[PDB]
Design an enzyme around this catalytic site. Structure first.
Site, short mmCIF file in Angstrom:
data_model
loop_
_atom_site.label_atom_id
_atom_site.label_comp_id
_atom_site.label_asym_id
_atom_site.label_seq_id
_atom_site.Cartn_x
_atom_site.Cartn_y
_atom_site.Cartn_z
N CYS A 183 4.48 0.93 9.34
CA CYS A 183 4.26 -0.14 8.37
C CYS A 183 5.57 -0.59 7.75
CB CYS A 183 3.29 0.33 7.29
SG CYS A 183 1.67 0.82 7.95
N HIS A 229 0.81 -1.22 0.00
CA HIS A 229 0.00 0.00 0.00
C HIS A 229 0.84 1.26 0.00
CE1 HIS A 229 0.76 0.93 4.23
NE2 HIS A 229 0.33 -0.27 4.59
N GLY A 231 3.46 5.47 10.31
CA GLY A 231 4.77 5.34 9.71
C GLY A 231 5.51 4.07 10.07
#
Ligand SMILES: Cc1ccc(NC(=O)c2ccc(CN3CCN(C)CC3)cc2)cc1Nc1nc(-c2cccnc2)cs1
Ligand SMILES: Cc1ccc(NC(=O)c2ccc(CN3CCN(C)CC3)cc2)cc1Nc1nc(-c2cccnc2)cs1
Lengths: 300, 300
Positions: free
Chosen positions: B145, B41, B143
């Site tokens: 991920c 993503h 942030g």
């Protein structure tokens, strides 16, 4: 979201751990530039655990008596000296993985990360608080002496603890990296016991603020107390008295949540008097006191 | 002595974390040999959070659209492809710090260490269990991920988790490193919620054995039950049923303490029915289920 016991990444310290062997005693040492630091009782003999005189023991030692291994690479010892309860071994190679570092001594209530090591090899990392009686409640088996505790500031490792021994109640004692013990302990087998301990009040409050930031709100209330009347109940439950400087440190957390510090004290008062009645706070059923206000701000 | 939440030394993983930027979206990636792995993503746009088709998005992307930074050293992307929910970016340099590694998928009840990272930079390490509903109760801000979870076997890093998202209840969901989500979750903003969770019974028992090894004994008793009658009460308190294979895994702990597994089940039965009555076990006031039998044996 979420709040977990969290330690500092340990890579910068892993690169400094070595194995120090003297005779048939092996523990871990810390290798920075061309010096290896380790606990002095690595020179202890079996018939000296009573009243050992370490100056005597060390004068009877030579450089070739200390075997230092960094992985499968033997380090040549070219000088030795004693720095209070730690030994300094000068080696012929500067550690190329040496990070920027500091030797600092912490206070009760402050936290640090522990890299537990066996035979110069890191096996796990965890978080610890220095208690009010200068013990830490660590996790340490035989051979862990010389494991170090640290904080990281940007790129700088602040070394604050070296592990030396375990007390009868199973808590742990050690020194700063200048060899000065935390607390009234000595590195010889006597009947030394930890003094009485107290709950770190400012840490409990910081932890309650982390709860509010994470959506746990059931302990809040409309009451508010004075600092003086809060300390009266704190003494009754073996909590440290709260100071104005402790209120100031909680300022940022208070502002972020919109909850006045003395409002949070009023909530903590009620928790002490009535308990939790089955409910939990951040996955715990007791009040946690091992998170500093800094630890909370960093994680939330 | 002592028993603490303990994570694996993180140095071998710190050396693999990089920052991956696409447009104005920045998360963390894992750099092994000449491949960078990160959540897909990172290619998502603002007007696509509804029903994004990632195949479409990725076909519209070029190699120069991905900016990869390993420290202050930009990595040149020379190929890209999608592997389920993770993106693979081929780079022109093999990571010289690449450790021996494996991609493995874990089961509910198993633990791993999480290296939380922001902008390709590790900030903390903690321990997690995969729950029965395939969520983890982590600590993750915006942030994070692309942060990974791992176990270490001797010198080998078994990567088992990459972080992708946070659910409404504040628990966390992600994939294995082949891009296959843990649980019935997808990487798009819908009303997905975690299913119901259960207590990991075999882990609670392992933790009770760690208590006995550490001198906590107040919960023991002279009673002993059958596996069948234990499972009857376990269902009533939302605990997983115990199997024979779970009894076998507890064998070594049972032998070390001299306490039969079904004897320890009889103790756990009484704890569920009467509670703890103020006392604590290993510094906790509830039953902990995030320590596997392996975690206990390793630490004690
Ligand atoms: C404080 C202190 C003072 C002296 C010693 N050293 C010894 O007791 C000892 C050292 C060496 C020997 C062997 N001798 C010397 C070598 N060799 C010639 C044979 C004889 C026998 C005993 C250790 C310590 N510290 C210890 N910490 C632990 C420990 C255990 C579990 C968790 N954390 C710390 C055990 S001992
Ligand atoms: C599952 C998922 C699906 C899609 C996305 N991406 C977005 O929502 C998003 C991505 C990029 C943009 C910006 N656009 C793209 C770049 N640019 C062209 C401008 C517009 C705007 C929104 C993130 C996620 N995952 C997330 N995890 C978190 C999170 C927060 C706190 C703790 N743990 C995880 C927030 S979002």
């Amino acid at each position: 979201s979420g709040f977990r016991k969290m330690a500092f990444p340990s890579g910068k310290v892993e690169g400094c751990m070595v194995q120090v062997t003297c005779g048939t005693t092996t523990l871990n040492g810390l290798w920075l530039d061309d010096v290896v630091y380790c606990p002095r009782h690595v020179i202890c003999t079996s018939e000296d655990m009573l009243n050992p005189n370490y100056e005597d023991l060390l004068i009877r030692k030579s450089n070739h008596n200390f075997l230092v291994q960094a992985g499968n690479v033997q380090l040549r010892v070219i000088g030795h000296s004693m720095q209070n309860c730690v030994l300094k071994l000068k080696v012929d190679t500067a550690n190329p993985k040496t990070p920027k570092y500091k030797f600092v001594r912490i206070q009760p209530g402050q936290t640090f990360s522990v890299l537990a090591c066996y035979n110069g090899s890191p096996s796990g990392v965890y978080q610890c608080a220095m208690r009010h009686n200068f013990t830490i409640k660590g996790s340490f088996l035989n051979g862990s002496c010389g494991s170090v505790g640290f904080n990281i500031d940007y790129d700088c490792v602040s070394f604050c603890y070296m592990h030396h021994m375990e007390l009868p109640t199973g808590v742990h004692a050690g020194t700063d990296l200048e060899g000065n013990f935390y607390g009234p302990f000595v590195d010889r087998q006597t009947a030394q016991a930890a003094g009485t301990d107290t709950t770190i009040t400012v840490n409990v409050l910081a932890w309650l603020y982390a709860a509010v930031i994470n959506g746990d709100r059931w302990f809040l209330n409309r009451f508010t107390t004075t600092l003086n009347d809060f300390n009266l109940v704190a003494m009754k439950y073996n909590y440290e008295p709260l100071t104005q400087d402790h209120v100031d440190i909680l300022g940022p957390l208070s502002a972020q949540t919109g909850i006045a510090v003395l409002d949070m004290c009023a909530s903590l008062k009620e928790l002490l008097q009535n308990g939790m009645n089955g409910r939990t706070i951040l996955g715990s059923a007791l009040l946690e006191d091992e998170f500093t206000p800094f630890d909370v701000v960093r994680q939330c």
